[PDB]
């Protein structure tokens, strides 16, 4: 009774009813729901109540060289607040919050919480290892902390509880509303690799097409591997409809009986591997089927060259036969594992057996230091083997919480490549999310994003999210309810306003202010956590400061009062609500940008990127962080010029925005670093040729790219004469020499992680955006196979292309966006 009311709560939180069984041909999902109860109960039981409640955000990574330079006399200052009194305490970087709290007991148990944020400085960790402390030192900000009560862990309450050949009969296909011919193609797939293919006779394409044909395959029943798919496709030759059926179910049983599968239409892609059937029964095409059944010196040199190549380089049959024959020598190299597991003939019982016998000897793999890039390779579309994939998830177990946040989005997307709903990787995301509130918060949104707009993976993700939500605790369930109610309310307003020329009229601005006033006094909760920044609690809408922006898509500019009084400022929380752009694509790029920032940190570099907050909430809709004191490069050009570009404008803008020369000199240095940062990052990703309306800058000189939704004279990246003027070049300058030095050092630093970026990219396009040629872009961009000296000049040439193009490209972009 109250059990049923709790499920409706979950349904509203998830955005999908998990109990629904109208779109299933088996009990996989229900078996998975049941399956995940154990990992859920196991993690809820093993987590420390106190640390789970306070969620301390910490890193074990060494403090970078640039932050060591910002700390004088091995002393950090912390301002400790309480009601009206605040004192500054000299703290050593190695001091534990427990020891610092004893100093505010002798110098005249409570907890140290960051001012105006739900972020605590607790646990056996030196302050230098707290992310917020690192954040403050990075931006040159004073650490303000408040002395208050630790939150009650009671609030985190969890509610109690055979030699025959394989064959398939194709009965027929049928579409309600369609003189071309048509045929059905049947494939036995195991991780992209087609083991066996069979076709039907072409019949005239009508509203109902019957065959009653037994399609005998070459592959034997015994040779079928677990995780193999019966891919059914309809070609008219152009492909129109597809559907997948797992030949061996979640119970290790060979699939039998009658099946009526509603197929997916066509507009490679993770959506093409889905075991799910089309929920649209009334309009979709459906298919009716029936089932009822030691090594030489030279070869080592050749093998080592194979192992060394990038993850995209294809293996020839020659390469594969070499890798397999010398699998035991190959097993001694963890970097070889993806290529070795691609040399496996999975449609042969004896070979798979030998592969499993091989995996028993994982000495080198197990002992090796974790390589994320290598681990990620084994979780892509090329590996359907549960045991192969499990060895990767095993390596991920050793990632610290800080690192899980870096890879979380890609890891959630990587669930799409899993043959079965319950999987080691799904369980891993469940385990990590339940162990940490920050991981859990993002995990919620990431999964909620896919459920909202992916009919291909909503059922699988909805099972995982229900599993999370059933163990996250009342506290967080309350937080997610407040967030879901707010965003649902605001999405309605976003779409309503878009429905009402690029001119923002008086009648439109009034209608928005009218709707927001109506929500405020109605059912909008008093406060809510910011989905892209869970540390911040937003309160009431500042209607006066709210507006509709003069754009193509007409987004909402919303401003909130901070719910936390303990904030040392009366700053408002700015959020943009937008319909028209695919923000899942923006989310993926931003996640890659943060991975690049972490790669530069390893080499003690800070290229000052601004990977702003961005959450996808539904179909072509979501929210974006308003970056305070920032403007568009085009708006700076519009203020002096109008519609033509002047080089002196940018440097002039930074001068008038600077109070002192001391702050202006810092603004120039920040522009040099940030420009170099975006120049390298956008180039590698192939999203460099951009209009200056899509590039922003802060009043503090920080340059940043925005609007990554959907991406002749071309340019590697945007390096315009106005950017070069801030560096002091029309020639060369000590700033421009510093710029080229940063670029090369940054570009070469990313090339040291070629395999990682290639995998992240390969996966990003498969789950977020395309063709083989689109994926191979990054190989050329990262100059795979070239030496550092040769690669150093390559990027220096790319910079020289920008200088030789000038304003040409920018000007042509201006013409493009004005028809
Ligand atoms: C960070 C960010 C990324 C992004 N991607 C798409 N929209 N979007 C908005 C963002 N945030 C932001 N913060 C402050 C802004 C601002 N955008 N804009 C405009 C808004 C329309 O597009 C051009 C920029 C301003 O005039 N100010 C003062």
Swiss-Prot record:
Phosphothreonine, modified sites: 754
Pathway linked to the protein: Phospholipid metabolism; phosphatidylinositol phosphate biosynthesis
Binding site for ATP: 574-583, 609-617, 704-711
Keywords, ordered alphabetically: Angiogenesis, ATP-binding, Cell membrane, Chemotaxis, Cytoplasm, Disease variant, Endocytosis, Immunity, Inflammatory response, Kinase, Lipid metabolism, Membrane, Nucleotide-binding, Phosphoprotein, Serine/threonine-protein kinase, Transferase
SUPFAM superfamilies to which the protein is assigned, alphabetical: ARM repeat (SSF48371), C2 domain (Calcium/lipid-binding domain, CaLB) (SSF49562), Protein kinase-like (PK-like) (SSF56112), Ubiquitin-like (SSF54236)
Database matches in CDD domains: C2_PI3K_class_I_gamma (cd08399), PI3Ka_I (cd00872), PI3Kc_IB_gamma (cd00894)
Region: Catalytic loop, residue numbers: 686-694
Reaction(s) the record says it catalyses: a 1,2-diacyl-sn-glycero-3-phospho-(1D-myo-inositol) + ATP = a 1,2-diacyl-sn-glycero-3-phospho-(1D-myo-inositol-3-phosphate) + ADP + H(+); a 1,2-diacyl-sn-glycero-3-phospho-(1D-myo-inositol-4,5-bisphosphate) + ATP = a 1,2-diacyl-sn-glycero-3-phospho-(1D-myo-inositol-3,4,5-trisphosphate) + ADP + H(+); a 1,2-diacyl-sn-glycero-3-phospho-(1D-myo-inositol 4-phosphate) + ATP = a 1,2-diacyl-sn-glycero-3-phospho-(1D-myo-inositol-3,4-bisphosphate) + ADP + H(+); L-seryl-[protein] + ATP = O-phospho-L-seryl-[protein] + ADP + H(+)
EC number per UniProt: 2.7.1.137, 2.7.1.153, 2.7.1.154, 2.7.11.1
Activation/inhibition comment: Activated by both the alpha and the beta-gamma G proteins following stimulation of G protein-coupled receptors (GPCRs). Activation by GPCRs is assisted by the regulatory subunits (PIK3R5 or PIK3R6) leading to the translocation from the cytosol to the plasma membrane and to kinase activation. Inhibited by AS-604850 and AS-605240.
Domain of life: Eukaryota
Region (G-loop): 548-554
Domain PIK helical: 294-471
Tissue spec: Pancreas, skeletal muscle, liver and heart.
Effect seen on changing residue 751 to P: In IMD97; loss of phosphatidylinositol-3,4-bisphosphate 5-kinase activity
GO molecular function terms listed in the Swiss-Prot or TrEMBL record: 1-phosphatidylinositol-3-kinase activity; 1-phosphatidylinositol-4,5-bisphosphate 3-kinase activity; 1-phosphatidylinositol-4-phosphate 3-kinase activity; ATP binding; ephrin receptor binding; identical protein binding; protein kinase activity; protein serine kinase activity
Outcome of substituting residue 578 to R: Loss of kinase activity. Loss of autophosphorylation. Reduced inflammatory reactions but no alterations in cardiac contractility
GO BP term (any one): phosphatidylinositol phosphate biosynthetic process
Subunit description: Heterodimer of a catalytic subunit PIK3CG and a PIK3R5 or PIK3R6 regulatory subunit. Interacts with GRK2 through the PIK helical domain. Interaction with GRK2 is required for targeting to agonist-occupied receptor. Interacts with PDE3B; regulates PDE3B activity and thereby cAMP levels in cells. Interacts with TPM2. Interacts with EPHA8; regulates integrin-mediated cell adhesion to substrate. Interacts with HRAS; the interaction is required for membrane recruitment and beta-gamma G protein dimer-dependent activation of the PI3K gamma complex PIK3CG:PIK3R6.
Additional detail: Candidate target in therapy for inflammatory diseases. Selective inhibitors and protein ablation are anti-inflammatory in multiple disease models such as asthma, rheumatoid arthritis, allergy, systemic lupus erythematosus, airway inflammation, lung injury and pancreatitis.
Function statement: Phosphoinositide-3-kinase (PI3K) that phosphorylates PtdIns(4,5)P2 (Phosphatidylinositol 4,5-bisphosphate) to generate phosphatidylinositol 3,4,5-trisphosphate (PIP3). PIP3 plays a key role by recruiting PH domain-containing proteins to the membrane, including AKT1 and PDPK1, activating signaling cascades involved in cell growth, survival, proliferation, motility and morphology. Links G-protein coupled receptor activation to PIP3 production. Involved in immune, inflammatory and allergic responses. Modulates leukocyte chemotaxis to inflammatory sites and in response to chemoattractant agents.
Name of the protein in its database record: Phosphatidylinositol 4,5-bisphosphate 3-kinase catalytic subunit gamma isoform
């Amino acid at each position: 009774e109250e059990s049923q009311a709790f499920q409706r709560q979950l349904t509203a939180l998830i955005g999908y009813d998990v109990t629904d069984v109208s779109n299933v041909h088996d009990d996989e999902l229900e078996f998975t729901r049941r399956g995940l109860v154990t990992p859920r109960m196991a993690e809820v039981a093993s987590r420390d109540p106190k640390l789970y409640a306070m969620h301390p955000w910490v890193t074990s990574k060494p403090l970078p060289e640039y932050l060591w330079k910002k700390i004088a006399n091995n002393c950090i200052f912390i301002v400790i607040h309480r009601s009206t009194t605040s004192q500054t305490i000299k703290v050593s970087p190695d001091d534990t919050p427990g020891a610092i709290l004893q100093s505010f007991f002798t110098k005249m148990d409570f907890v140290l919480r960051v001012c105006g944020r739900d972020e605590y400085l607790v646990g056996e960790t030196p302050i230098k290892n707290f992310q917020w402390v690192r954040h403050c030192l990075k931006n040159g900000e004073e650490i303000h902390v408040v002395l208050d009560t630790p939150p009650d862990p009671a609030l985190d309450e969890v509610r109690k509880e055979c030699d025959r050949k394989f064959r398939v009969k194709i009965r027929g296909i049928d579409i309600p509303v369609l003189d071309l011919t048509v045929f059905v193609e049947a494939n036995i797939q195991h991780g992209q690799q087609v083991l066996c293919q069979r076709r039907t006779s072409p019949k005239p394409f009508t509203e109902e097409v019957l065959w009653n044909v037994w399609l005998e395959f070459s592959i034997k029943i015994k040779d079928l591997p677990k995780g193999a798919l019966l891919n059914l496709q309809i070609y008219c030759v152009q492909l129109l409809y597809y559907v997948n059926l797992l030949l061996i179910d979640h119970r290790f049983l060979l699939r039998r009986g009658e099946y009526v599968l509603h197929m997916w239409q066509i507009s490679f892609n993770a959506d093409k591997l889905t075991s799910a059937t089309n929920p649209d029964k009334e309009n979709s095409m459906s298919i009716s089927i029936l089932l009822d059944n030691e090594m030489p010196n030279q070869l080592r040199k050749q093998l080592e060259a194979i192992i060394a190549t990038d993850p995209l380089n294809p293996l020839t049959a020659e390469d594969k036969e070499l890798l397999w024959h010398f699998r035991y020598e190959s097993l001694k190299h963890p970097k070889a594992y993806p290529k070795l597991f691609s040399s496996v003939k999975w449609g042969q019982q004896e070979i798979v057996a030998k592969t499993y016998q091989l995996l028993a000897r994982r000495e080198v793999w197990d002992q090796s230091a974790l390589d994320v890039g290598l681990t990620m390779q084994l979780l892509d579309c090329n590996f359907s083997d549960e045991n192969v994939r499990a060895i990767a998830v095993q390596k991920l177990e050793s990632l610290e919480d800080d690192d899980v946040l870096h890879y979380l989005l890609q890891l959630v997307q990587a669930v799409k490549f899993e043959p079965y709903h319950d999987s080691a990787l799904a369980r891993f995301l469940l385990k990590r999310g339940l162990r940490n509130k920050r991981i859990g918060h993002f995990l919620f949104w990431f999964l909620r994003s896919e459920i909202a707009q992916s009919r291909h993976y909503q059922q699988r993700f909805a099972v995982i999210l229900e599993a999370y939500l059933r163990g996250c605790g009342t506290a967080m369930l309350h937080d997610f309810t407040q967030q879901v109610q707010v965003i649902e309310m605001l999405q309605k307003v976003t779409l309503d306003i878009k429905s009402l020329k690029y001119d923002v009229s008086s009648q439109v601005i009034s209608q928005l202010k009218q709707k927001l006033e109506n929500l405020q006094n109605s059912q909008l909760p008093e406060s809510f956590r910011v989905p892209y920044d869970p540390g911040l609690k937003a309160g009431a809408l500042a209607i006066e400061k709210c507006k509709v922006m003069a754009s193509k898509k007409k987004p909402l500019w919303l401003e909130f009062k901070c719910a936390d009084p303990t904030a040392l400022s009366n700053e408002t929380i700015g959020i943009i609500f937008k319909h028209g752009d695919d923000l899942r694509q923006d989310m993926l790029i931003l996640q890659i940008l943060r991975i690049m920032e972490s790669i530069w940190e390893t080499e003690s570099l800070d290229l000052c990127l601004l990977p702003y907050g961005c959450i996808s909430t539904g179909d072509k809709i979501g929210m974006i962080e308003i970056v305070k004191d920032a403007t568009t490069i085009a708006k700076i050009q519009q203020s002096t010029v109008g519609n033509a570009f002047k080089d002196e404008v940018l440097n002039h803008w930074l001068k008038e925005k600077s109070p002192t020369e001391e702050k202006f000199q810092a603004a120039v240095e920040r522009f040099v670093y940030s420009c170099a940062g975006y120049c390298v990052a956008t180039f590698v990703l192939g999203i460099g040729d951009r209009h200056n309306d899509n590039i922003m800058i802060t009043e503090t000189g920080n340059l940043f790219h925005i609007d990554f939704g959907h991406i002749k004279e071309r340019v590697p990246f945007v390096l315009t004469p106005d950017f070069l003027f801030v560096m002091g070049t029309s020639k060369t300058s000590p700033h421009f020499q510093k710029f080229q030095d940063i670029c090369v050092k940054a570009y070469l630093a990313l090339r040291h992680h070629t395999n990682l970026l290639i995998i992240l990219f390969s996966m990003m396009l498969m789950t977020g955006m395309t063709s083989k040629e689109d994926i191979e872009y990054i190989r050329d961009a990262l100059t795979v196979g070239k030496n550092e000296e040769d690669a150093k000049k390559y990027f220096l040439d790319q910079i020289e292309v920008c200088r030789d193009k000038g304003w040409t490209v920018q000007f042509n972009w201006f013409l493009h966006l004005v028809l």
